[PDB]
Amino acid sequence: SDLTFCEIILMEMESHDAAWPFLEPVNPRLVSGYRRIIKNPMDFSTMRHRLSRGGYTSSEEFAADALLVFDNCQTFNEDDSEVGKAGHIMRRFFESRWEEFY
């Protein structure tokens, strides 16, 4: 019953104005040397793939992947960059919705 809310939250994040950096895996042709720094990439497409296939055994596991998206953003980008700002917006949005649903 808790896992059904993850799809709803995922859809809301996919639709958010600030979500553009996170929709698909980082493209290494666009973001030079990404994997030198980010050893465990994550993105909303990968999360959708796993959620749709029972790859999350609990809502907590889904939340951990959401936070990994934002933690990787914060590790790679300065807070005042456009992508860094987007990550902070999305983390706040995610955490707020998580509290409402749970």
> Alpha-carbon distance 99 to 30, whole Å?
34
Residues 22-81 interacting with ligand WCS (rule: CB under 6 A): 22, 26, 30-31, 72-73, 76-77
Q: Does 83 bind ligand WCS (CB under 6 A)?
A: yes
Between 20 and 101, whose beta carbon lies closer to ligand WCS? Answer: 20
Q: How far is the CB of 39 from ligand WCS (least distance, A)?
A: 12
Is residue 5 within 8 Å of 13, Cβ to Cβ? no
- Helices marked H in 15-58 — which ranges? 34-37, 44-51
CA separation for the pair 49, 35 (Å, rounded): 21
Nearer to ligand WCS, 9 or 18 (CB): 18
Residue 21 makes contact with ligand WCS by CB under 6 A: yes
The angle subtended at Cα 58 by Cα 19 and Cα 83, nearest 5°, is 15
Question: Any idea how long the chain is?
Answer: 102
Q: How far is the CB of 25 from ligand WCS (least distance, A)?
A: 9
Please count the residues of this chain forming the interface with ligand WCS, following the rule CB under 6 A. 11
- Residues forming contacts to ligand WCS in the complex (CB under 6 A) are 21-22, 26, 30-31, 72-73, 76-77, 83, 87
